[PDB]
Amino acid sequence: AQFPIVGLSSTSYHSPGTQLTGNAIKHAEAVINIDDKLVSNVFIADVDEAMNHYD
Amino acid sequence: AQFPIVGLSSTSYHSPGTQLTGNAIKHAEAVINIDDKLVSNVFIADVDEAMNHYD
Amino acid sequence: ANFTPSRLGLVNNTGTGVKDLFLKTFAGEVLSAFRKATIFEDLHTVRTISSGKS
């Protein structure tokens, strides 16, 4: 995923007889990758459950 | 703009037989000038606006 | 560029001083001074007499 970022600004006093140009604003971004799959497994035998005295 | 400043006074004891001349009061002023015009500006192209995926 | 304003203030269009032919305005308020605190007017008794020296 991508989260763009923005924000720059400026101000000035203008000299008469000239033409305004602009103040350059440039951006950036922060990306977030996705990890692999996380697992948690277990196995239980039947005879162990049959001989046990609790669940 | 101009802001006049006032505020004086004085009292004394008058001896009869002489003529009262008064007291001297004078004023002062404050002036505030107006600067040039502040400007903030930016130019954004058209191809970038077409390609981009957010406002 | 492509513009040559006269600035409406320059004399003979020579040198600087584009604000030589301008005058100031009156904002519309006089400042004056503050008033001190007078606490001894009260805190004592004031009498009046019609005639006599004391």
XYZ file of N, CA, C and O in Angstrom:
656
model
N 0.840 -1.187 0.000
C 0.000 0.000 0.000
C 0.879 1.242 0.000
O 2.045 1.198 0.395
N 0.308 2.355 -0.454
C 1.035 3.609 -0.597
C 0.263 4.734 0.077
O -0.932 4.908 -0.177
N 0.950 5.497 0.925
C 0.367 6.655 1.606
C 1.103 7.912 1.170
O 2.191 8.210 1.696
N 0.569 8.675 0.219
C 1.268 9.882 -0.237
C 1.288 10.973 0.824
O 0.383 11.088 1.653
N 2.343 11.786 0.779
C 2.547 12.896 1.703
C 2.740 14.167 0.889
O 3.258 14.123 -0.233
N 2.320 15.303 1.454
C 2.314 16.576 0.747
C 2.573 17.694 1.754
O 2.561 17.482 2.968
N 2.815 18.895 1.232
C 2.859 20.103 2.033
C 4.160 20.881 2.032
O 5.133 20.514 2.694
N 4.139 21.998 1.306
C 5.189 23.006 1.252
C 4.523 24.319 0.874
O 3.536 24.331 0.134
N 5.061 25.428 1.375
C 4.487 26.723 1.036
C 5.509 27.817 1.306
O 6.433 27.649 2.105
N 5.320 28.946 0.624
C 6.231 30.078 0.732
C 5.453 31.360 0.480
O 4.306 31.336 0.028
N 6.100 32.484 0.783
C 5.535 33.807 0.564
C 6.668 34.776 0.260
O 7.817 34.548 0.649
N 6.342 35.857 -0.444
C 7.362 36.802 -0.883
C 6.717 38.155 -1.142
O 5.493 38.282 -1.223
N 7.566 39.172 -1.261
C 7.153 40.484 -1.737
C 7.420 40.590 -3.234
O 8.475 40.184 -3.726
N 6.452 41.146 -3.955
C 6.475 41.161 -5.409
C 7.093 42.453 -5.927
O 6.785 43.545 -5.438
N 7.972 42.318 -6.920
C 8.550 43.470 -7.598
C 7.643 43.880 -8.750
O 7.295 43.029 -9.580
N 7.235 45.143 -8.840
C 6.285 45.536 -9.887
C 6.890 45.418 -11.278
O 8.096 45.584 -11.477
N 6.024 45.126 -12.247
C 6.425 44.992 -13.628
C 6.849 43.602 -14.048
O 7.103 43.385 -15.241
N 6.933 42.655 -13.120
C 7.332 41.290 -13.423
C 6.131 40.356 -13.336
O 5.043 40.740 -12.899
N 6.345 39.115 -13.765
C 5.298 38.104 -13.809
C 5.579 37.027 -12.769
O 6.706 36.528 -12.674
N 4.556 36.678 -11.992
C 4.701 35.639 -10.980
C 4.991 34.295 -11.634
O 4.482 33.987 -12.716
N 5.821 33.490 -10.971
C 6.274 32.214 -11.508
C 5.715 31.021 -10.751
O 5.110 30.131 -11.356
N 5.904 30.977 -9.446
C 5.398 29.896 -8.622
C 6.486 29.337 -7.729
O 7.682 29.463 -7.996
N 6.060 28.703 -6.643
C 6.959 28.061 -5.697
C 6.782 26.554 -5.807
O 5.673 26.043 -5.619
N 7.869 25.850 -6.111
C 7.792 24.428 -6.415
C 7.481 23.625 -5.160
O 8.158 23.764 -4.137
N 6.458 22.780 -5.245
C 6.059 21.889 -4.160
C 6.228 20.461 -4.662
O 5.661 20.094 -5.699
N 6.999 19.655 -3.933
C 7.202 18.259 -4.289
C 6.803 17.366 -3.123
O 6.842 17.777 -1.959
N 6.412 16.138 -3.452
C 5.762 15.223 -2.530
C 6.683 14.052 -2.185
O 7.852 14.007 -2.583
N 6.140 13.101 -1.431
C 6.816 11.853 -1.102
C 5.745 10.841 -0.716
O 4.549 11.142 -0.733
N 6.179 9.631 -0.368
C 5.230 8.589 -0.003
C 5.900 7.593 0.928
O 7.128 7.500 0.994
N 5.067 6.851 1.653
C 5.511 5.779 2.531
C 4.741 4.515 2.185
O 3.507 4.503 2.246
N 5.462 3.456 1.827
C 4.848 2.201 1.415
C 5.005 1.181 2.534
O 5.964 1.219 3.314
N 4.040 0.269 2.614
C 4.000 -0.761 3.646
C 3.788 -2.098 2.952
O 2.723 -2.338 2.370
N 4.792 -2.968 3.013
C 4.700 -4.282 2.402
C 3.980 -5.255 3.332
O 3.692 -4.956 4.493
N 3.688 -6.441 2.804
C 2.920 -7.461 3.508
C 3.812 -8.675 3.729
O 4.446 -9.166 2.787
N 3.862 -9.152 4.970
C 4.701 -10.285 5.327
C 4.105 -11.584 4.785
O 3.081 -11.598 4.096
N 4.760 -12.696 5.105
C 4.280 -14.011 4.706
C 3.170 -14.451 5.658
O 2.681 -13.674 6.483
N 2.754 -15.710 5.557
C 1.655 -16.217 6.367
C 2.192 -16.773 7.679
O 3.239 -17.426 7.706
N 1.471 -16.506 8.761
C 1.840 -16.942 10.098
C 0.957 -18.120 10.491
O -0.260 -18.077 10.296
N 1.564 -19.178 11.037
C 0.830 -20.399 11.349
C 1.169 -20.880 12.755
O 2.205 -20.539 13.327
N 0.261 -21.692 13.310
C 0.442 -22.265 14.646
C -0.406 -23.537 14.722
O -1.628 -23.454 14.870
N 0.248 -24.697 14.640
C -0.441 -25.971 14.479
C -0.047 -26.952 15.578
O 0.919 -26.739 16.313
N -0.814 -28.040 15.676
C -0.600 -29.065 16.696
C -1.299 -30.340 16.244
O -2.224 -30.301 15.429
N -0.844 -31.481 16.768
C -1.408 -32.790 16.452
C -1.588 -33.599 17.730
O -0.715 -33.594 18.602
N -2.716 -34.300 17.835
C -3.056 -35.081 19.021
C -3.392 -36.506 18.603
O -4.217 -36.716 17.708
N -2.763 -37.480 19.256
C -3.035 -38.886 18.996
C -4.322 -39.327 19.690
O -4.830 -38.669 20.601
N -4.848 -40.469 19.244
C -6.116 -40.968 19.767
C -5.932 -41.750 21.064
O -6.736 -41.610 21.994
N -4.891 -42.580 21.141
C -4.666 -43.381 22.339
C -4.343 -42.487 23.529
O -4.742 -42.774 24.665
N -3.609 -41.397 23.292
C -3.316 -40.451 24.362
C -4.595 -39.845 24.923
O -4.752 -39.726 26.144
N -5.523 -39.459 24.046
C -6.803 -38.934 24.507
C -7.633 -40.003 25.204
O -8.410 -39.686 26.111
N -7.489 -41.266 24.798
C -8.277 -42.331 25.409
C -7.779 -42.663 26.812
O -8.582 -42.953 27.706
N -6.462 -42.638 27.023
C -5.903 -42.974 28.327
C -5.881 -41.800 29.300
O -5.667 -42.019 30.497
N -6.099 -40.575 28.830
C -5.988 -39.407 29.689
C -7.162 -39.328 30.663
O -8.230 -39.904 30.442
N -6.947 -38.600 31.759
C -7.972 -38.394 32.774
C -8.471 -36.953 32.826
O -9.172 -36.587 33.775
N -8.137 -36.133 31.831
C -8.680 -34.786 31.725
C -8.648 -34.352 30.265
O -7.955 -34.946 29.435
N -9.413 -33.307 29.962
C -9.539 -32.805 28.602
C -8.493 -31.733 28.318
O -8.124 -30.949 29.198
N -1.439 55.996 8.422
C -2.303 56.668 9.379
C -1.477 57.449 10.392
O -0.285 57.192 10.581
N -2.124 58.412 11.042
C -1.492 59.252 12.050
C -2.323 59.220 13.324
O -3.547 59.384 13.274
N -1.661 59.007 14.457
C -2.324 58.934 15.760
C -1.792 60.041 16.661
O -0.669 59.931 17.184
N -2.543 61.120 16.867
C -2.057 62.196 17.742
C -2.030 61.767 19.201
O -2.870 60.987 19.657
N -1.052 62.294 19.937
C -0.863 61.986 21.350
C -0.965 63.280 22.147
O -0.315 64.276 21.809
N -1.778 63.262 23.203
C -1.986 64.412 24.071
C -1.782 63.948 25.513
O -1.425 62.800 25.775
N -2.014 64.865 26.448
C -1.969 64.576 27.868
C -0.901 65.325 28.637
O 0.246 64.884 28.733
N -1.316 66.440 29.237
C -0.504 67.298 30.088
C -1.423 68.001 31.071
O -2.628 68.117 30.838
N -0.837 68.500 32.158
C -1.524 69.413 33.067
C -0.534 69.866 34.131
O 0.488 69.216 34.367
N -0.856 70.990 34.773
C -0.029 71.537 35.844
C -0.840 72.563 36.620
O -1.607 73.324 36.024
N -0.668 72.583 37.941
C -1.301 73.565 38.810
C -0.239 74.275 39.640
O 0.856 73.755 39.863
N -0.579 75.477 40.100
C 0.335 76.276 40.904
C -0.477 77.159 41.842
O -1.710 77.148 41.829
N 0.233 77.930 42.661
C -0.374 78.903 43.557
C -0.218 80.299 42.970
O 0.897 80.733 42.663
N -1.338 80.999 42.819
C -1.357 82.306 42.182
C -1.295 83.411 43.226
O -2.096 83.451 44.166
N -0.336 84.314 43.042
C -0.195 85.493 43.887
C -0.951 86.647 43.248
O -0.612 87.054 42.125
N -1.977 87.192 43.900
C -2.745 88.281 43.285
C -1.874 89.499 43.009
O -0.950 89.817 43.762
N -2.183 90.181 41.910
C -1.423 91.328 41.456
C -0.699 91.121 40.145
O -0.219 92.101 39.561
N -0.603 89.886 39.662
C 0.041 89.577 38.394
C -0.954 88.918 37.447
O -2.008 88.425 37.858
N -0.602 88.915 36.164
C -1.468 88.381 35.123
C -1.112 86.931 34.821
O 0.065 86.580 34.698
N -2.138 86.092 34.704
C -1.938 84.684 34.388
C -1.609 84.520 32.910
O -2.356 84.982 32.043
N -0.487 83.859 32.627
C -0.067 83.597 31.257
C -0.486 82.224 30.751
O -0.531 82.013 29.535
N -0.787 81.293 31.646
C -1.222 79.965 31.275
C -0.144 78.918 31.474
O 0.754 79.047 32.311
N -0.248 77.855 30.684
C 0.717 76.767 30.705
C 0.949 76.292 29.279
O 0.119 76.513 28.394
N 2.085 75.635 29.063
C 2.478 75.193 27.732
C 2.160 73.713 27.565
O 2.670 72.875 28.316
N 1.323 73.396 26.579
C 0.960 72.024 26.243
C 1.317 71.786 24.782
O 0.964 72.594 23.914
N 2.014 70.684 24.511
C 2.362 70.301 23.151
C 2.086 68.815 22.956
O 2.055 68.035 23.911
N 1.884 68.435 21.698
C 1.452 67.096 21.329
C 2.541 66.374 20.545
O 3.565 66.952 20.170
N 2.300 65.087 20.300
C 3.177 64.252 19.493
C 2.310 63.352 18.624
O 1.079 63.363 18.722
N 2.952 62.562 17.764
C 2.209 61.756 16.807
C 2.864 60.391 16.664
O 4.052 60.213 16.945
N 2.064 59.425 16.219
C 2.550 58.114 15.816
C 2.049 57.822 14.411
O 0.881 58.072 14.096
N 2.933 57.297 13.565
C 2.606 56.988 12.179
C 2.922 55.523 11.913
O 3.868 54.966 12.483
N 2.104 54.892 11.074
C 2.281 53.499 10.681
C 2.166 53.418 9.165
O 1.116 53.747 8.602
N 3.231 52.967 8.511
C 3.265 52.878 7.059
C 2.757 51.520 6.585
O 2.705 50.547 7.341
N 2.384 51.467 5.309
C 1.840 50.263 4.691
C 2.877 49.699 3.730
O 3.390 50.419 2.864
N 3.176 48.411 3.876
C 4.237 47.752 3.124
C 3.740 47.384 1.726
O 2.699 47.856 1.263
N 4.500 46.543 1.028
C 4.114 46.057 -0.291
C 3.081 44.940 -0.141
O 2.526 44.711 0.937
N 2.809 44.225 -1.231
C 1.790 43.182 -1.257
C 2.452 41.810 -1.185
O 3.329 41.495 -1.996
N 2.032 41.003 -0.212
C 2.506 39.630 -0.094
C 1.829 38.750 -1.136
O 0.656 38.942 -1.460
N 2.575 37.781 -1.661
C 2.075 36.901 -2.712
C 2.507 35.469 -2.423
O 3.635 35.224 -1.981
N 1.601 34.527 -2.671
C 1.897 33.101 -2.645
C 1.278 32.469 -3.881
O 0.082 32.647 -4.136
N 2.082 31.733 -4.645
C 1.645 31.265 -5.952
C 2.291 29.925 -6.270
O 3.320 29.555 -5.698
N 1.668 29.203 -7.199
C 2.118 27.873 -7.596
C 1.474 27.540 -8.936
O 0.306 27.860 -9.173
N 2.246 26.904 -9.816
C 1.772 26.479 -11.126
C 1.830 24.961 -11.224
O 2.877 24.361 -10.959
N 0.715 24.349 -11.616
C 0.602 22.900 -11.737
C 0.216 22.559 -13.168
O -0.742 23.121 -13.708
N 0.954 21.630 -13.773
C 0.767 21.289 -15.176
C -0.511 20.473 -15.370
O -1.289 20.242 -14.440
N -0.723 20.029 -16.608
C -1.918 19.290 -16.997
C -1.675 17.796 -17.151
O -2.530 16.991 -16.769
N -0.526 17.404 -17.708
C -0.215 15.986 -17.849
C -0.098 15.325 -16.481
O -0.557 14.193 -16.282
N 0.524 16.015 -15.522
C 0.613 15.484 -14.167
C -0.768 15.315 -13.550
O -1.043 14.309 -12.885
N -1.654 16.291 -13.758
C -3.012 16.180 -13.241
C -3.761 15.020 -13.883
O -4.562 14.353 -13.217
N -3.514 14.760 -15.170
C -4.165 13.635 -15.834
C -3.643 12.300 -15.319
O -4.424 11.371 -15.084
N -2.324 12.183 -15.141
C -1.737 10.911 -14.725
C -2.057 10.587 -13.268
O -2.330 9.429 -12.932
N -2.024 11.591 -12.395
C -2.106 11.367 -10.959
C -3.442 10.733 -10.577
O -4.437 10.822 -11.300
N -3.452 10.080 -9.414
C -4.599 9.305 -8.958
C -5.278 9.897 -7.728
O -6.086 9.210 -7.093
N -4.979 11.146 -7.373
C -5.696 11.815 -6.295
C -5.667 13.319 -6.527
O -4.817 13.843 -7.251
N -6.616 14.010 -5.900
C -6.769 15.445 -6.091
C -5.797 16.217 -5.208
O -5.509 15.819 -4.076
N 8.776 40.917 -18.031
C 8.635 42.363 -17.918
C 7.455 42.863 -18.744
O 6.298 42.681 -18.362
N 7.764 43.499 -19.878
C 6.759 44.015 -20.809
C 5.830 45.027 -20.145
O 4.657 45.143 -20.513
N 6.343 45.770 -19.167
C 5.558 46.786 -18.481
C 6.507 47.785 -17.835
O 7.484 47.393 -17.193
N 6.211 49.073 -18.009
C 7.024 50.160 -17.463
C 6.107 51.140 -16.741
O 5.756 52.197 -17.283
N 5.688 50.815 -15.520
C 4.836 51.739 -14.766
C 5.591 52.995 -14.357
O 6.802 52.974 -14.125
N 4.850 54.101 -14.270
C 5.435 55.371 -13.855
C 5.514 55.514 -12.340
O 6.160 56.451 -11.858
N 4.840 54.633 -11.595
C 4.873 54.571 -10.134
C 4.130 55.737 -9.493
O 3.959 55.768 -8.270
N 3.698 56.705 -10.307
C 2.823 57.794 -9.876
C 3.434 58.674 -8.789
O 2.763 59.574 -8.273
N 4.693 58.434 -8.430
C 5.305 59.181 -7.348
C 6.673 59.751 -7.659
O 7.185 60.585 -6.907
N 7.277 59.311 -8.759
C 8.609 59.772 -9.121
C 8.549 61.158 -9.748
O 7.645 61.463 -10.532
N 9.520 61.998 -9.398
C 9.643 63.341 -9.953
C 10.704 63.320 -11.045
O 11.823 62.839 -10.830
N 10.338 63.808 -12.230
C 11.195 63.859 -13.411
C 11.678 62.484 -13.859
O 12.551 62.396 -14.732
N 11.125 61.408 -13.290
C 11.509 60.036 -13.629
C 13.017 59.828 -13.489
O 13.656 59.176 -14.317
N 13.589 60.392 -12.428
C 15.022 60.314 -12.177
C 15.262 59.852 -10.748
O 14.678 60.401 -9.808
N 16.119 58.844 -10.590
C 16.490 58.384 -9.267
C 15.377 57.616 -8.569
O 14.433 57.112 -9.184
N 15.508 57.532 -7.250
C 14.559 56.839 -6.396
C 13.630 57.853 -5.728
O 13.658 59.050 -6.028
N 12.797 57.372 -4.808
C 11.837 58.231 -4.142
C 10.469 58.205 -4.790
O 9.934 59.248 -5.177
N 9.892 57.010 -4.914
C 8.595 56.830 -5.558
C 7.473 57.234 -4.608
O 6.295 57.209 -4.980
N 7.828 57.603 -3.377
C 6.856 57.990 -2.361
C 7.092 59.416 -1.874
O 6.737 59.762 -0.745
N 7.694 60.255 -2.719
C 7.983 61.631 -2.331
C 6.745 62.518 -2.367
O 6.660 63.483 -1.599
N 5.783 62.215 -3.239
C 4.609 63.055 -3.445
C 3.355 62.481 -2.790
O 2.260 62.583 -3.353
N 3.492 61.882 -1.610
C 2.375 61.268 -0.910
C 2.276 61.822 0.506
O 3.275 62.241 1.098
N 1.058 61.818 1.043
C 0.774 62.353 2.365
C 0.065 61.308 3.216
O -0.547 60.366 2.704
N 0.153 61.491 4.530
C -0.401 60.555 5.495
C -1.848 60.910 5.833
O -2.333 62.004 5.535
N -2.537 59.960 6.462
C -3.954 60.082 6.773
C -4.167 60.143 8.279
O -3.253 59.914 9.075
N -5.401 60.463 8.661
C -5.812 60.522 10.057
C -6.670 59.302 10.365
O -7.762 59.151 9.805
N -6.176 58.436 11.253
C -6.881 57.193 11.547
C -8.234 57.453 12.195
O -9.216 56.766 11.890
N -8.309 58.431 13.092
C -9.575 58.765 13.713
C -9.672 58.388 15.176
O -10.743 57.991 15.645
N -8.566 58.500 15.908
C -8.571 58.225 17.337
C -7.395 58.936 17.988
O -6.268 58.868 17.491
N -7.668 59.613 19.101
C -6.653 60.306 19.885
C -6.342 59.463 21.112
O -7.253 58.969 21.785
N -5.049 59.304 21.403
C -4.619 58.307 22.380
C -4.718 58.822 23.812
O -5.237 58.124 24.689
N -4.209 60.030 24.067
C -4.201 60.633 25.398
C -3.378 59.806 26.379
O -2.489 59.052 25.971
N -3.663 59.940 27.674
C -2.891 59.295 28.726
C -3.825 58.621 29.724
O -5.045 58.795 29.689
N -3.229 57.840 30.621
C -3.967 57.103 31.636
C -4.272 57.991 32.837
O -3.753 59.100 32.973
N -5.133 57.483 33.714
C -5.553 58.186 34.918
C -5.050 57.439 36.146
O -5.283 56.235 36.283
N -4.368 58.157 37.035
C -3.822 57.546 38.236
C -4.937 57.160 39.203
O -6.090 57.578 39.072
N -4.576 56.343 40.189
C -5.517 55.940 41.223
C -5.486 56.942 42.370
O -4.417 57.264 42.898
N -6.662 57.434 42.752
C -6.807 58.392 43.843
C -7.588 57.719 44.963
O -8.816 57.602 44.885
N -6.880 57.279 46.001
C -7.498 56.557 47.108
C -7.677 57.413 48.351
O -8.445 57.022 49.243
N -7.008 58.557 48.443
C -7.072 59.403 49.626
C -8.207 60.418 49.579
O -8.347 61.205 50.519
N -9.004 60.435 48.507
C -10.181 61.299 48.478
C -11.137 60.936 49.607
O -11.558 61.800 50.385
N -11.486 59.658 49.710
C -12.147 59.113 50.885
C -11.075 58.808 51.935
O -9.948 59.301 51.840
N -11.420 58.023 52.956
C -10.554 57.667 54.078
C -10.264 58.853 54.987
O -9.395 58.759 55.863
N -10.961 59.969 54.797
C -10.925 61.090 55.726
C -12.194 61.900 55.520
O -12.846 61.809 54.477
N -12.541 62.693 56.529
C -13.818 63.393 56.545
C -13.671 64.793 55.965
O -12.705 65.503 56.258
N -14.643 65.187 55.147
C -14.665 66.498 54.508
C -15.822 67.293 55.097
O -16.979 66.854 55.043
N -15.510 68.456 55.657
C -16.499 69.386 56.182
C -16.542 70.636 55.312
O -15.697 70.845 54.437
N -17.544 71.474 55.562
C -17.698 72.723 54.834
C -18.189 73.811 55.776
O -19.007 73.554 56.664
N -17.679 75.025 55.581
C -18.104 76.195 56.336
C -18.445 77.307 55.356
O -17.952 77.336 54.224
N -19.303 78.226 55.797
C -19.765 79.307 54.936
C -18.892 80.550 55.026
O -18.622 81.184 53.999
N -18.440 80.911 56.224
C -17.608 82.091 56.403
C -16.559 81.795 57.462
O -16.618 80.776 58.154
N -15.591 82.690 57.570
C -14.542 82.563 58.558
C -13.222 82.141 57.933
O -13.154 81.650 56.803
N -12.150 82.342 58.700
C -10.808 82.018 58.240
C -10.319 80.654 58.704
O -9.372 80.124 58.112
N -10.931 80.073 59.731
C -10.497 78.783 60.251
C -11.651 78.152 61.021
O -12.654 78.804 61.324
